[PDB]
Design a protein around this ligand. Structure first.
Ligand SMILES: Nc1ncnc2c1ncn2[C@@H]1O[C@H](COP(=O)(O)OP(=O)(O)OP(O)(O)=S)[C@@H](O)[C@H]1O
Ligand SMILES: [Mg+2]
Lengths: 576, 34, 62
């Protein structure tokens, strides 16, 4: 709309897919060297009282006098009124001039036609300008990140979150960690009045009866051998029959339904079933113990305490035969005694309430409070997972996710009954996803994928959204991305990664890929629906920053030969 | 884009939105979790 | 290997209680790995590929 200025050069080749501009003055190029760089935008004429925006993709300079070349691609159209449409409807003829895009025009276009603003940094050409996107489109849909090492992913994510939590509307966010990093990025002065629930391996409370079928079957059992059939059947039978005795009131229970159910009792039952011996005498078509006393209903005695039975014999007077399931179940008993013997996993098997007593069926509510917290204020929670072993990570993640989806659906229904949309949004942040969401992985992690797949598809309707972070996107699930509506690309170098991230992402010709491996530290590229159009941007450092204190090695070697009092260490090392 | 024997020739079209459309403290009192 | 790792663990606990990070690092150099860490191999070589692995995922800290 305003005075654009003095132009650069005319056109020399045109088409819907490609455009080619040609400069022949060096003094003109060196003056505007900063804008004509890749990613930025240019204006072309397509008749009187219209203009067309193009994205620079490809530059070339030759000396034979000079000859420059700027290849471009079209996005949309703009009038003199100010309106910005989209979708090409014109091919520009030659001998038509071109101009450079000033900021003022971009700011004007940004302000008006944007419904609700959310700031996401500053453009590169000018730092004293703020890039904006739609307030609602972004945080109500599935984001993604991918960056090579050193590209500053963590800091940028921390900045985004800080803005989402008003650190420089009440929002709920959970951030899974693997490095103990994002804890300090929220350690403002206590008086700020925004709740923070830090969790770990010592204080986390998460009973084992909340599991679904796959997790329970996965922790205590391996189905590789020939005995994989019978174990599962009788395990299910045992768990069910033990579920009721402790929860009588309720009705129509099943393997999946969650309520308290001890485990040591199930072990006792399985053992007592290992050694059974039946009697075949008259009117004695049932078991027989050591004290010559039959049994009617197994469930009444087998749980209480181990029992011993008489020996197998064939006498006509003492006719005792062996049981059906004797012998088979020998290993899993020791395997389970072991897993329960583990101290480091105590938080899952043998947990304790604050007072000291074990949990009960009713504390379910509180189990979620930790993730939910206070209702009318932001309650960012930072789970930690370093102390957790490598075998239970998938299980932990699946449970902590399902427990949130259920709540979402429940409050979505509770509000559907009323007729108003839910005002409680929940964001999930999954860091270093490539460890526990493998695309090349098999059953070793089968329990994790699904717990997230749901959010990938359903979550949007209910009220919870994702945010995936990774650094090697090739070895990540094909399904978790495709459901991502917006992409932030920071520096990437490894070729195969370029190929994959170019494929998945639609509006990427050769140049938009030639821009990835030359970005600076702090920059980024944005592609999706939250903006009007693709854009190149720059961030600032977050305050306070994440540190993730670590063991320095060389600075410690230069010190003295510190006496490791092995005595005291091993002494404390009871492990009994 | 349509492909196959039905049309007179391959071709691209666009669809009009179909009206009607397809859509589908004490809060957590479901310990049953069902 | 298991011994090393467990020692580092029980020591990190103490110095963390004290509030200070560890000061006794260890570097395990492994040679001709492919003789005792197979990719396609039997359970006979399942006692090693596990233990050493615990160091990769949960080492930096302790
Ligand atoms: N705009 C900026 N100007 C100057 N330095 C920056 C800027 N943005 C980021 N940095 C620097 O980037 C450095 C390290 O980035 P990190 O946060 O370590 O990246 P990262 O998220 O740890 O990536 P990794 O190593 O794969 S976990 C910090 O020391 C910052 O000073
Ligand atoms: Mg990081």
């Amino acid at each position: 709309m305003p005075d654009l200025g003095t132009p650069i050069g005319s056109v020399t080749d045109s088409s819907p897919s490609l455009i080619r501009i040609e400069i022949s003055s060096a003094e003109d190029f060196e003056k505007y060297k900063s804008m004509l760089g890749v990613g930025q935008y240019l204006l072309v004429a397509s008749g009187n009282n219209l203009y067309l925006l193009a994205s620079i993709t490809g530059v070339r300079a030759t000396h034979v006098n000079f000859r420059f070349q700027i290849d471009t691609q079209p996005i949309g159209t703009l009038s003199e009124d100010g309106e910005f449409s989209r979708g090409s409807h014109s091919l520009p003829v030659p001998t038509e001039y071109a101009y450079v895009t000033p900021p003022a025009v971009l700011e004007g276009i940004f302000s008006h036609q944007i419904k609700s603003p959310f700031a996401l940094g500053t453009l590169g050409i000018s730092p004293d300008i703020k890039l904006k996107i739609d307030g609602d489109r972004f945080f109500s849909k599935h984001v993604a990140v991918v960056g090579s090492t050193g590209s500053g992913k963590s800091c940028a994510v921390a900045k985004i979150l800080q803005t989402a939590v008003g650190i420089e509307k009440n929002s709920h966010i959970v951030i899974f960690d693997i490095h103990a990093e994002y804890a300090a990025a929220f350690n403002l002065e206590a008086g700020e009045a925004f709740t923070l629930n830090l969790l770990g391996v010592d204080n986390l409370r998460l009973p084992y009866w909340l599991m679904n079928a796959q997790e329970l079957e996965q922790i205590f059992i391996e189905s590789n051998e020939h005995n994989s059939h019978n174990q599962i059947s009788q395990f299910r039978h045992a768990v069910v029959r033990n579920k009721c005795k402790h929860n009588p009131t309720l009705t129509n229970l099943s393997f999946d339904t969650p309520v308290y159910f001890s485990i040591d009792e199930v072990v006792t039952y399985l053992e007592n079933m290992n050694n059974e011996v039946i009697g075949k005498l008259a009117g004695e078509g049932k078991p027989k113990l050591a004290n010559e006393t039959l049994v009617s209903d197994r469930d009444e005695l087998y749980f209480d305490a181990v029992q011993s039975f008489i020996v197998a014999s064939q006498a006509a007077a003492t006719k005792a035969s062996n049981g059906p399931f004797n012998g088979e179940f020998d290993r899993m008993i020791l395997r389970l005694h072991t897993r329960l013997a583990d101290p480091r996993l105590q938080f899952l098997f043998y947990p304790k309430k604050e007072d000291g007593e074990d949990l009960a069926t009713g504390d379910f509510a509180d189990v979620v409070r930790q993730f939910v917290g206070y209702m009318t204020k932001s309650n960012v929670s930072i789970i930690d997972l370093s102390g957790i072993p490598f075998e239970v990570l998938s299980i932990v993640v699946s449970l902590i996710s399902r427990m949130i989806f259920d709540f979402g659906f429940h409050y979505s229904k509770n509000r559907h009954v009323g007729g108003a949309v839910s005002d409680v949004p929940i964001l999930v942040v999954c860091e270093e996803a490539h460890n526990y969401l493998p695309r090349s992985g098999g059953a070793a992690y089968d329990a994790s994928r699904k717990s997230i797949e749901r959010i990938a598809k359903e979550g949007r309707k209910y009220g919870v959204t994702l945010m995936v972070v990774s650094q090697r996107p090739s070895e990540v699930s094909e399904t978790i991305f495709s459901q991502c509506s917006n992409f932030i690309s920071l520096r990437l170098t490894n070729a195969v990664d370029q190929t994959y991230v170019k494929s998945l992402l639609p509006d990427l010709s050769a140049g938009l890929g030639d821009l990835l491996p030359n970005l600076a530290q702090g920059e980024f590229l944005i592609v999706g629906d939250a903006p009007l159009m693709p854009t190149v941007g720059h961030f600032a450092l977050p305050v306070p920053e994440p540190h993730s204190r670590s063991v320095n090695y060389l600075q410690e070697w230069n010190s003295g030969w510190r006496h490791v009092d092995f005595d005291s260490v091993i002494d404390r090392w009871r492990g009994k």
